[PDB]
Amino acid sequence: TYNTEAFDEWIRSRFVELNSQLEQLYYQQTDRANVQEVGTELKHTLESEGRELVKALLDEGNTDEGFDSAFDLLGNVGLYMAACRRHEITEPTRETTSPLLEASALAMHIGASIGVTPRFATAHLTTHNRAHNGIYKRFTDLPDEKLFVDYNTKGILAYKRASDALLKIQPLGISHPISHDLLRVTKQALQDVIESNQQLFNRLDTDRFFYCVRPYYKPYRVGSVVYRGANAGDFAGINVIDLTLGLCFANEASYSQMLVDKFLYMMPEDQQILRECMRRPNLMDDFLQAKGCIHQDWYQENLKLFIEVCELHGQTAIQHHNELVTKYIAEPSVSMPLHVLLASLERLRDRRAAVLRDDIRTRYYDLKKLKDSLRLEHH
Amino acid sequence: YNTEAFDEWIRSRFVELNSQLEQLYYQQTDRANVQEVGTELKHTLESEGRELVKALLDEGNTDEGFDSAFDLLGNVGLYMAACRRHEITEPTRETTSPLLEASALAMHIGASIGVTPRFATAHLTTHNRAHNGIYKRFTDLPDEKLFVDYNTKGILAYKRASDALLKIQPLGISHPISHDLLRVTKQALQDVIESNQQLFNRLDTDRFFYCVRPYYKPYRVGSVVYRGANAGDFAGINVIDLTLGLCFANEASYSQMLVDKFLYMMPEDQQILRECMRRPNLMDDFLQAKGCIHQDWYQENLKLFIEVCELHGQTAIQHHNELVTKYVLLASLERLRDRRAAVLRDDIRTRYYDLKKLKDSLRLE
Amino acid sequence: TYNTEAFDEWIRSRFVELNSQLEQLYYQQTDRANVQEVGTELKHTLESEGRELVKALLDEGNTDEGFDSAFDLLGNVGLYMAACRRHEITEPTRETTSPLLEASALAMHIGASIGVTPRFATAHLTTHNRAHNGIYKRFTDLPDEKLFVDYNTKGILAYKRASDALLKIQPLGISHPISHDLLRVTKQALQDVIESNQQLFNRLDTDRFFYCVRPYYKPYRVGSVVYRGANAGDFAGINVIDLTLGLCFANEASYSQMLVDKFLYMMPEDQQILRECMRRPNLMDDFLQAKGCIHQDWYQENLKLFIEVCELHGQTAIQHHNELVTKYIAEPSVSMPLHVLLASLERLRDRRAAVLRDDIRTRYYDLKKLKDSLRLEHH
Amino acid sequence: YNTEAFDEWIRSRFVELNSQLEQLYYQQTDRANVQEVGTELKHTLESEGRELVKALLDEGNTDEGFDSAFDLLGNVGLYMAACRRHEITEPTRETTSPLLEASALAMHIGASIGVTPRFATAHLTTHNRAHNGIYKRFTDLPDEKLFVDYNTKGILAYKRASDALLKIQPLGISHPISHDLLRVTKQALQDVIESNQQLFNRLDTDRFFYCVRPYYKPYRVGSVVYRGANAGDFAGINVIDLTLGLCFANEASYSQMLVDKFLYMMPEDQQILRECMRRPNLMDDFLQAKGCIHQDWYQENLKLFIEVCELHGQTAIQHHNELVTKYVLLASLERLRDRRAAVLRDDIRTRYYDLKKLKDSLRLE
Ligand code: HEM
Ligand code: HEM
């Protein structure tokens, strides 16, 4: 694993220096978002040194060191390609196919060999970013990047705690007393998300993030195909909650399509779990079907807690869209299909908040029926 | 409708018969005696259950999915377990099981889905589906419900602890996020201490030993004798042992224990457990990071790491001096409790010294 | 499974009648490839009856009857959508999104839920086409369709026999005596393919196939995304042979991309096996590395048989391209990106035949070195 | 390098020591005796192997992948099996295994990958990697090579038969393509008959019973006794039994047999086998298609189907009267051979009548 080590050590050293030093130049500019005619020397070094190290890896050909080893390597290749994209060394709408031949072949080889997208994925920097003596992979040494990544990690892990609790209710049923504890575990995990997102909101520098962090999550070509950038939402957890709570519907083209466009962007194990939720029942419909149990102790106790969980999830979606996406994407973007991705994100936030709409299906009425169901039972 | 017919029976008459039978046993002076008592109730339980099982055995091969099959196997196991409790079947008395139909069915399902052909802990705890608030049980006794509910709470708390620990593996012990997982682990283990305490302060020692425990006895399935389920039949607890490095897979005593429980947990738990047997542990990781002693992450993470090991080892003594003390291989149970607690011993390998070295490693700071 | 049964029984009855009767009209025409202003009544019935049956299924929502049941249902939905595409009831370059709302949602739901493409796949009509009292799913009752499907099935099954034998050599090694038998089993299976393809070549009606069979394998939209038609080559087997024999290379963008574009078009189990071959060694390189064993009995005996297998595979690719694709696609198409897909198919045939080229990597030299290696050893 | 050091030993000195030892045993008059003979060679085999194993046990947890671990377990099992053959270790003589290091290592790997902690058939047959033409073996005797090679050929032929049969399931018995799979199945089963015949006509009855078979004896791993491998330890053969409907998973006798062999085959073979236990079979399918008697597919497919059942049942008698006849649970071996052959019996359920009904069903045509 000499060649593999050599590339990783490069990613954890010079790679960070080159990008950092390059970000310094971009920030000094007046445009700040411009990359043309700047750091031309640093770009050649980053491209050159990375390619050689990658080329050494591409020579070894087929290797089977296990999923973790392969995924880690693919991450470095993706981190490398992502940087080249940020610095305009490679640009999709400018090419017909990727100019980074070696890296593309290697990335497409590993990705297809382990069932993941042939590029940098969220897990590469968050849940599966191995730290060496305290430092883990990063594009730059900027404090704002670390804040973004760490809080995405905290957020993601909090959602996993919430989806795991929800999945354990399935075998017990909504009337099970133990389901009341899982429901509370779920509630706490979702609150950890609200808190996690708040801290990020109160510490991340809006400007530094939009000009020095975000530009590394851009779409770029791998081979001839264009692959979009990773999202902090690329993991089963969040969608597992949507389906299990019944807030979203797999039978709707809009939602299933979204799942399809993200499967390869998460771990194989997360894909398996997500797909399975698409053919399992949900708690919403369960409670709705238990109308003749309205005067049951477990019903009032569990429905009450359930409804609270549905609200927290919707709260977390409003917090994300209304606050996070708003303060670091929409605003800085108006100053410097954007209105399209914003509109999709809205239907998503409203789908979780269960608001009233006529253009899309929502649980507003179902949730209201259940809320008004708890009224009749407190007697 | 046969599956449901049997399930509905298990959730109704089955509970009545056992309950009514437990009433007779308790009135006795011996109370542990079952000979010449409830002979009528025993015949009914055996008879009604067999007929319902026989109807199922006729359908032959069925593939309704893992959950459906496991649930059915649970009812068959619950039925056979009852028969064992009431002496309708007794291992040291037989050469092979007298419950022919139930045995065939149980062995068929179990082997078909990779689980033991009898009632397993998950059948009554994590995978016990409730209907309108009531879930499978042997009797309607309050002490059974206390035992099962707290075993469930305990088990689920351990799963939260093992899941947090496994997420550190890809991040490493020096990762800042590993400090949060380590704290999540600490909290989950505390939930176990609290969970066990509540059980200790509410369960009726007598009712449990004469009306609850006798349903977890060993009985024959076919010609083979299969031991009773244990609240410790799940990956979680052993995942923590290996990940924290408190136990060693390279030791016959421990790997044998794992082998004797694999079939007693869910296939998914088996997969996870086996995997931990070929993965590194945090203990050795910290020990190998001696040249990082003056690192911020080393001081912070290690402290919590040691607090985690102490909560686990300590939560071990509590259990050891409870379901084992108040109620052959006694030594094998002491070594297990000693490895977890990392006590000092000369007969078995322990982390006592390694843990002390690490505790005193925080000293310099 | 009433609604599921109702739809299947429809697919096996009226569906076949409507398409058949419709094919009769198209054939009578002078253009014969025209579909405008013809069978307008039959089209409305096919579209109408199918949609209603699908709509009934879409209502049931999430169901978990097992992989086989779900895959079978998805097949009927795909068969239905494919027909609508053939009859121009739906056309990709004419739409922005699919006009078949219910069918799209259902197809995308099942597909994503079990990890397969949301449309009709080769297995749906070949290896996983269940027959009822002798009759299995089909678009029409035409004899030429049955010939096409049956021989694709025979061909596919023969390739599976060849890939399975090759994979069993891996744990034994190329010098193992038992590997000589597997190598012979492989040789026989590949010959069954040559024979299978020959029979198809000598019995299929070139015209009927191009105007009455092939038009059902066209690309159509599912939701907003366009999904290409199934190919008799959508299964692990063929590519497993390519990689195990070392005739193709996973480290090349061109090949890995091709694998990615077909994974969802085969069974999950075939995907698993294929991906794994991308990180395993191959026999070609093994033999090349055993140069200091040239005077070994197993070497001459096994290398000789190996080289024969490589030739048969290449023979089967030439037979397919030069004969089959030529007589039923290229010619009838010149009479009535086509030159693009033909060019890709050529690089593929030459990759297996191991011919000499400068534009792509081939085993021509490696195979020649090994052939000339057997000469030195027969002494 | 420890893994390779042990493997290279198994492929060199290990073979020499055992071979040289077999020479001494054969010269004797008893020939089956091992007491007071080759005492020097035994010490060397035990000593050299243990040291190499001890080096491996030190590395602790390793995750080099299933193939690497399984291969290593095989060497450890081959080593322990030899020690058993030479009486260096004997089950009915011990309470626990005297080979401490080897036991721990074997139990560790086996449990970590889900296989029995000893030498399994695949270790010498389908998964025995050859180096420059030579693959793992206990001795250099020609009769061992004959036994192993033909077991391998037999096994691979059965895998071809089970794979063809499983591909009919999704197509159905009335599918035209099922007629080809049925013929592929027929040919594969014939390859088995031929394979077994060659073994019968070449293997030296004496050399095999005194120099080959004694290496497949049962021995202790830890404290548990694990039986020796059988050329029948793989899914294939049992997949054919269930798919053809010749055997029944709902019968304790058969499901128990499956349970006692799962760990003796590859995890992938276990998965496939278990699944067959909850799937339909062709026998019952044909029986249920009585109102299709005058169908073309019914006549053609059924004929070949019956020829397949007869080849299997007949290939059973051959084996039964060979490795069992020429060389307790003898009855359980008769019933198995009788279910496969579908003979007439009153003590166990068989397909004799069902098969006769189907044979006479072709009569009307
Ligand atoms: C200021 C920081 C953040 C910003 C600027 C941000 C921005 C975005 C953007 C613009 C998208 C849309 C997808 C695309 O077109 O690529 C997205 C998706 C998503 N984000 Fe964030 N994000 C932030 C933090 C977080 C955190 C901490 C979480 C927690 C896990 C998270 C979870 C998600 C989810 C789950 C999705 C998908 C939509 C859905 O299914 O509802 N994000 N984010
Ligand atoms: C006259 C009958 C047949 C014709 C017209 C035909 C045509 C084609 C076409 C045009 C393609 C290109 C893919 C696309 O753009 O969709 C293709 C692919 C393929 N065909 Fe056929 N085919 C026939 C029979 C068969 C049979 C019997 C087999 C046997 C399994 C088969 C195996 C393949 C393979 C494996 C591929 C992929 C290319 C590769 O990886 O080499 N085809 N076929």
Short mmCIF file of N, CA and C in Angstrom, two decimals, chain B residues 124-197:
data_model
loop_
_atom_site.label_atom_id
_atom_site.label_comp_id
_atom_site.label_asym_id
_atom_site.label_seq_id
_atom_site.Cartn_x
_atom_site.Cartn_y
_atom_site.Cartn_z
N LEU B 124 -39.35 -12.16 22.83
CA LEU B 124 -40.16 -11.49 23.84
C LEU B 124 -39.75 -10.03 24.08
N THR B 125 -38.55 -9.65 23.64
CA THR B 125 -38.10 -8.28 23.87
C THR B 125 -38.15 -7.32 22.69
N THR B 126 -37.06 -7.22 21.95
CA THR B 126 -36.98 -6.29 20.83
C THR B 126 -37.86 -6.62 19.64
N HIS B 127 -38.26 -7.88 19.50
CA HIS B 127 -39.11 -8.26 18.38
C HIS B 127 -40.45 -8.87 18.80
N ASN B 128 -40.98 -8.40 19.92
CA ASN B 128 -42.26 -8.86 20.46
C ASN B 128 -43.33 -7.83 20.06
N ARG B 129 -44.04 -8.09 18.97
CA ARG B 129 -45.08 -7.17 18.52
C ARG B 129 -46.29 -7.08 19.44
N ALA B 130 -46.68 -5.86 19.78
CA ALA B 130 -47.82 -5.63 20.65
C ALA B 130 -49.09 -5.40 19.83
N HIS B 131 -50.20 -5.92 20.34
CA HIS B 131 -51.49 -5.74 19.68
C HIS B 131 -52.34 -4.94 20.65
N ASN B 132 -52.71 -3.74 20.23
CA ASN B 132 -53.52 -2.88 21.07
C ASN B 132 -52.91 -2.80 22.48
N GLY B 133 -51.59 -2.62 22.56
CA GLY B 133 -50.93 -2.49 23.86
C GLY B 133 -50.40 -3.73 24.55
N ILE B 134 -50.90 -4.90 24.17
CA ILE B 134 -50.45 -6.14 24.78
C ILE B 134 -49.53 -6.92 23.83
N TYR B 135 -48.41 -7.40 24.36
CA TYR B 135 -47.46 -8.17 23.57
C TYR B 135 -47.32 -9.57 24.16
N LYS B 136 -46.80 -10.52 23.38
CA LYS B 136 -46.63 -11.91 23.81
C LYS B 136 -46.06 -12.05 25.21
N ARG B 137 -46.57 -13.02 25.96
CA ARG B 137 -46.13 -13.27 27.32
C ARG B 137 -46.57 -14.67 27.70
N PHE B 138 -45.95 -15.23 28.72
CA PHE B 138 -46.29 -16.58 29.17
C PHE B 138 -47.49 -16.50 30.10
N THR B 139 -47.49 -15.47 30.95
CA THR B 139 -48.55 -15.27 31.92
C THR B 139 -48.97 -13.81 31.96
N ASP B 140 -49.93 -13.50 32.82
CA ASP B 140 -50.37 -12.11 32.95
C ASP B 140 -49.79 -11.49 34.22
N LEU B 141 -48.87 -12.20 34.85
CA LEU B 141 -48.23 -11.73 36.07
C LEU B 141 -47.45 -10.42 35.88
N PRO B 142 -47.58 -9.49 36.84
CA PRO B 142 -46.90 -8.19 36.79
C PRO B 142 -45.39 -8.32 36.81
N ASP B 143 -44.89 -9.33 37.51
CA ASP B 143 -43.45 -9.54 37.61
C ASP B 143 -42.79 -10.00 36.31
N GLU B 144 -43.56 -10.65 35.44
CA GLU B 144 -43.03 -11.08 34.16
C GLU B 144 -42.85 -9.83 33.32
N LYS B 145 -43.89 -9.00 33.27
CA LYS B 145 -43.87 -7.76 32.52
C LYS B 145 -42.70 -6.88 32.96
N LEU B 146 -42.40 -6.86 34.25
CA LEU B 146 -41.29 -6.05 34.73
C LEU B 146 -39.97 -6.59 34.20
N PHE B 147 -39.81 -7.90 34.27
CA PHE B 147 -38.60 -8.58 33.81
C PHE B 147 -38.38 -8.33 32.31
N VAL B 148 -39.40 -8.60 31.50
CA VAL B 148 -39.30 -8.42 30.06
C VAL B 148 -39.07 -6.96 29.66
N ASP B 149 -39.89 -6.04 30.18
CA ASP B 149 -39.74 -4.62 29.85
C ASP B 149 -38.36 -4.06 30.17
N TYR B 150 -37.82 -4.41 31.33
CA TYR B 150 -36.51 -3.90 31.69
C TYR B 150 -35.40 -4.62 30.94
N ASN B 151 -35.65 -5.85 30.49
CA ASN B 151 -34.63 -6.52 29.70
C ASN B 151 -34.60 -5.80 28.36
N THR B 152 -35.79 -5.46 27.86
CA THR B 152 -35.91 -4.73 26.60
C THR B 152 -35.22 -3.37 26.70
N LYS B 153 -35.51 -2.63 27.76
CA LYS B 153 -34.89 -1.32 27.97
C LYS B 153 -33.38 -1.47 28.08
N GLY B 154 -32.94 -2.49 28.82
CA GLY B 154 -31.51 -2.71 28.98
C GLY B 154 -30.87 -3.00 27.64
N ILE B 155 -31.46 -3.94 26.91
CA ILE B 155 -30.93 -4.35 25.62
C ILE B 155 -30.84 -3.17 24.66
N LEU B 156 -31.91 -2.40 24.55
CA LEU B 156 -31.91 -1.25 23.66
C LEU B 156 -30.88 -0.21 24.07
N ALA B 157 -30.61 -0.11 25.37
CA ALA B 157 -29.63 0.86 25.81
C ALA B 157 -28.24 0.39 25.39
N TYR B 158 -28.00 -0.91 25.44
CA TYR B 158 -26.70 -1.44 25.04
C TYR B 158 -26.48 -1.30 23.54
N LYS B 159 -27.56 -1.37 22.77
CA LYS B 159 -27.45 -1.24 21.32
C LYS B 159 -27.03 0.18 20.98
N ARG B 160 -27.53 1.14 21.75
CA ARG B 160 -27.17 2.54 21.55
C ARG B 160 -25.68 2.69 21.86
N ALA B 161 -25.20 2.00 22.89
CA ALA B 161 -23.78 2.10 23.24
C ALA B 161 -22.88 1.43 22.20
N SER B 162 -23.27 0.27 21.69
CA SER B 162 -22.44 -0.41 20.71
C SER B 162 -22.44 0.33 19.36
N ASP B 163 -23.57 0.92 18.99
CA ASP B 163 -23.62 1.64 17.73
C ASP B 163 -22.71 2.86 17.76
N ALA B 164 -22.66 3.56 18.89
CA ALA B 164 -21.79 4.73 19.00
C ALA B 164 -20.32 4.33 18.89
N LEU B 165 -19.95 3.26 19.58
CA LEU B 165 -18.59 2.77 19.58
C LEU B 165 -18.14 2.34 18.18
N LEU B 166 -19.03 1.69 17.43
CA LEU B 166 -18.67 1.25 16.09
C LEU B 166 -18.46 2.41 15.13
N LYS B 167 -19.08 3.55 15.39
CA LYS B 167 -18.91 4.69 14.51
C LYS B 167 -17.58 5.43 14.73
N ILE B 168 -16.84 5.04 15.77
CA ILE B 168 -15.55 5.66 16.05
C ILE B 168 -14.50 5.02 15.16
N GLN B 169 -14.66 3.73 14.91
CA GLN B 169 -13.73 2.96 14.09
C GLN B 169 -13.25 3.68 12.83
N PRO B 170 -14.19 4.17 11.99
CA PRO B 170 -13.76 4.87 10.77
C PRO B 170 -13.17 6.27 11.02
N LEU B 171 -13.46 6.86 12.18
CA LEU B 171 -12.95 8.18 12.51
C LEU B 171 -11.62 8.15 13.26
N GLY B 172 -11.40 7.11 14.06
CA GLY B 172 -10.17 7.01 14.82
C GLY B 172 -10.32 7.62 16.20
N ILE B 173 -9.49 7.20 17.15
CA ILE B 173 -9.58 7.71 18.51
C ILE B 173 -9.16 9.16 18.69
N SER B 174 -8.42 9.71 17.73
CA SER B 174 -7.97 11.10 17.82
C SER B 174 -8.93 12.08 17.17
N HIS B 175 -9.98 11.57 16.54
CA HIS B 175 -10.93 12.45 15.86
C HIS B 175 -11.78 13.20 16.87
N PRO B 176 -12.01 14.50 16.63
CA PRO B 176 -12.83 15.27 17.57
C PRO B 176 -14.25 14.74 17.70
N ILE B 177 -14.83 14.31 16.58
CA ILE B 177 -16.18 13.79 16.63
C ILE B 177 -16.25 12.52 17.49
N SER B 178 -15.13 11.81 17.62
CA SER B 178 -15.08 10.58 18.42
C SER B 178 -15.29 10.89 19.90
N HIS B 179 -15.14 12.16 20.25
CA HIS B 179 -15.33 12.58 21.63
C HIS B 179 -16.82 12.62 21.93
N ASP B 180 -17.62 12.96 20.92
CA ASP B 180 -19.07 13.02 21.08
C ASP B 180 -19.66 11.59 21.12
N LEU B 181 -19.13 10.71 20.27
CA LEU B 181 -19.61 9.33 20.21
C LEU B 181 -19.29 8.66 21.52
N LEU B 182 -18.13 9.02 22.06
CA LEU B 182 -17.66 8.48 23.32
C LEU B 182 -18.58 8.93 24.45
N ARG B 183 -19.14 10.13 24.31
CA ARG B 183 -20.03 10.66 25.32
C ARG B 183 -21.40 10.03 25.12
N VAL B 184 -21.76 9.77 23.86
CA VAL B 184 -23.05 9.14 23.58
C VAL B 184 -22.99 7.74 24.18
N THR B 185 -21.83 7.10 24.04
CA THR B 185 -21.62 5.77 24.58
C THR B 185 -21.76 5.79 26.10
N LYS B 186 -21.15 6.79 26.73
CA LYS B 186 -21.20 6.94 28.18
C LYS B 186 -22.65 7.07 28.65
N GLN B 187 -23.42 7.94 28.00
CA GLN B 187 -24.81 8.12 28.39
C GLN B 187 -25.65 6.83 28.25
N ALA B 188 -25.47 6.11 27.14
CA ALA B 188 -26.20 4.87 26.89
C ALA B 188 -25.90 3.83 27.97
N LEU B 189 -24.63 3.74 28.36
CA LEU B 189 -24.24 2.79 29.41
C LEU B 189 -24.89 3.22 30.74
N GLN B 190 -25.00 4.53 30.98
CA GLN B 190 -25.64 4.99 32.21
C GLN B 190 -27.11 4.60 32.18
N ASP B 191 -27.73 4.66 31.00
CA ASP B 191 -29.14 4.28 30.89
C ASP B 191 -29.33 2.82 31.30
N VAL B 192 -28.29 2.02 31.09
CA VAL B 192 -28.32 0.62 31.45
C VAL B 192 -28.27 0.49 32.96
N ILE B 193 -27.36 1.24 33.59
CA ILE B 193 -27.23 1.21 35.05
C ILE B 193 -28.58 1.58 35.66
N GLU B 194 -29.16 2.68 35.18
CA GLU B 194 -30.44 3.12 35.68
C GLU B 194 -31.53 2.09 35.41
N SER B 195 -31.54 1.55 34.20
CA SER B 195 -32.52 0.55 33.82
C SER B 195 -32.46 -0.65 34.76
N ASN B 196 -31.26 -1.17 34.98
CA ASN B 196 -31.08 -2.30 35.87
C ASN B 196 -31.48 -1.98 37.31
N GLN B 197 -31.23 -0.75 37.75
CA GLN B 197 -31.56 -0.34 39.11
C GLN B 197 -33.07 -0.39 39.30
#
